[PDB]
Amino acid sequence: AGSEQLKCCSGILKEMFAKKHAAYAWPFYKPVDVEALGLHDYCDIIKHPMDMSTIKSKLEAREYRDAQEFGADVRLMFSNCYKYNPPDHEVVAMARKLQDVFEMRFAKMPD
Amino acid sequence: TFKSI
């Protein structure tokens, strides 16, 4: 189970990285660039940054004990975006579309 | 705003 579910988790992240979703997924591919103009306060507000490449790397290094831990990191990524940005920000609408994908796949995972 | 280009 633990084993089968984490393989499903890898599949979910793979879909999140797919061309199908790239139009709204791309801001989450790599760590937020805290050096860029506009993001000088990012680390004041976000104590635990997370992004898809870091999650992919965590899966591959077997750093998740179960699907729950994988799921917590994906949701951390989304919550960081909701926390940092104004709710009318374009990146927030992108996060929701990507989260729709994750939540639906994560929920439909066999048990 | 910039991060979403």
UniProtKB/Swiss-Prot annotation, chain A:
It is found in: Nucleus; Chromosome. Phosphorylation by CK2 disrupt the intramolecular binding between the bromo domain 2 and the NPS region and promotes binding between the NPS and the BID regions, leading to activate the protein and promote binding to acetylated histones. In absence of phosphorylation, BRD4 does not localize to p53/TP53 target gene promoters, phosphorylation promoting recruitment to p53/TP53 target promoters. Ubiquitously expressed. Residues 3-109 form the Bromo domain. The record marks 85 as: Acetylated histone binding. Belongs to the BET family. JQ1, a thieno-triazolo-1,4-diazepine derivative, and I-BET, a benzodiazepine derivative, have been tested on tumors with success. Treatment with GSK1210151A (I-BET151, a I-BET derivative) has strong effets on mixed lineage leukemia and promotes myeloid differentiation and leukemia stem-cell depletion. Interacts with p53/TP53; the interaction is direct. Interacts (via CTD region) with CDK9 and CCNT1, acting as an associated component of P-TEFb complex. Interacts with RELA (when acetylated at 'Lys-310'). Interacts (via NET domain) with NSD3, CHD4, BICRA and ATAD5. The interaction with BICRA bridges BRD4 to the GBAF complex. Interacts (via NET domain) with JMJD6 (via JmjC and N-terminal domains); the interaction is stronger in presence of ssRNA and recruits JMJD6 on distal enhancers. Interacts with NSD3. Interacts with NIPBL. (Microbial infection) Interacts with bovine papillomavirus type 1 regulatory protein E2. This interactions may serve for the tethering of viral genomes to host mitotic chromosomes allowing successful partitioning of the viral genome during cell division. The NET domain mediates interaction with a number of chromatin proteins involved in transcription regulation (NSD3, JMJD6, CHD4, GLTSCR1 and ATAD5). It is linked to Cornelia de Lange syndrome 6: A form of Cornelia de Lange syndrome, a clinically heterogeneous developmental disorder associated with malformations affecting multiple systems. It is characterized by facial dysmorphisms, abnormal hands and feet, growth delay, cognitive retardation, hirsutism, gastroesophageal dysfunction and cardiac, ophthalmologic and genitourinary anomalies. CDLS6 inheritance is autosomal dominant. This is Bromodomain-containing protein 4. The chain holds residues 351 to 459 of 1362 of the full protein.
UniProtKB/Swiss-Prot annotation, chain B:
The modification N6-acetyllysine is found at residue 3. Coiled coil: none annotated. It is found in: Nucleus; Cytoplasm. The modification N6-methyllysine is found at residue 3. It comes from the Eukaryota. Ubiquitinated by RNF182, leading to its proteasomal degradation. Degradation is required for termination of NF-kappa-B response. Polyubiquitinated via 'Lys-29'-linked ubiquitin; leading to lysosomal degradation. Monomethylated at Lys-3 by SETD6. Monomethylation at Lys-3 is recognized by the ANK repeats of EHMT1 and promotes the formation of repressed chromatin at target genes, leading to down-regulation of NF-kappa-B transcription factor activity. Phosphorylation at Ser-4 disrupts the interaction with EHMT1 without preventing monomethylation at Lys-3 and relieves the repression of target genes. The modification Phosphoserine is found at residue 4. It is linked to A chromosomal aberration involving ZFTA is found in more than two-thirds of supratentorial ependymomas. Translocation with ZFTA produces a ZFTA-RELA fusion protein. ZFTA-RELA translocations are potent oncogenes that probably transform neural stem cells by driving an aberrant NF-kappa-B transcription program. Autoinflammatory disease, familial, Behcet-like 3: An autosomal dominant, mucocutaneous disease characterized by chronic mucosal lesions, in absence of recurrent infections. Component of the NF-kappa-B p65-p50 complex. Component of the NF-kappa-B p65-c-Rel complex. Homodimer; component of the NF-kappa-B p65-p65 complex. Component of the NF-kappa-B p65-p52 complex. May interact with ETHE1. Binds TLE5 and TLE1. Interacts with TP53BP2. Binds to and is phosphorylated by the activated form of either RPS6KA4 or RPS6KA5. Interacts with ING4 and this interaction may be indirect. Interacts with CARM1, USP48 and UNC5CL. Interacts with IRAK1BP1. Interacts with NFKBID. Interacts with NFKBIA. Interacts with GSK3B. Interacts with NFKBIB. Interacts with NFKBIE. The transcriptional activation domain 3/TA3 does not participate in the direct transcriptional activity of RELA but is involved in the control by RELA of the accessibility of target gene promoters. Mediates interaction with ZBTB7A. NF-kappa-B is a pleiotropic transcription factor present in almost all cell types and is the endpoint of a series of signal transduction events that are initiated by a vast array of stimuli related to many biological processes such as inflammation, immunity, differentiation, cell growth, tumorigenesis and apoptosis. NF-kappa-B is a homo- or heterodimeric complex formed by the Rel-like domain-containing proteins RELA/p65, RELB, NFKB1/p105, NFKB1/p50, REL and NFKB2/p52. The heterodimeric RELA-NFKB1 complex appears to be most abundant one. This is Transcription factor p65.
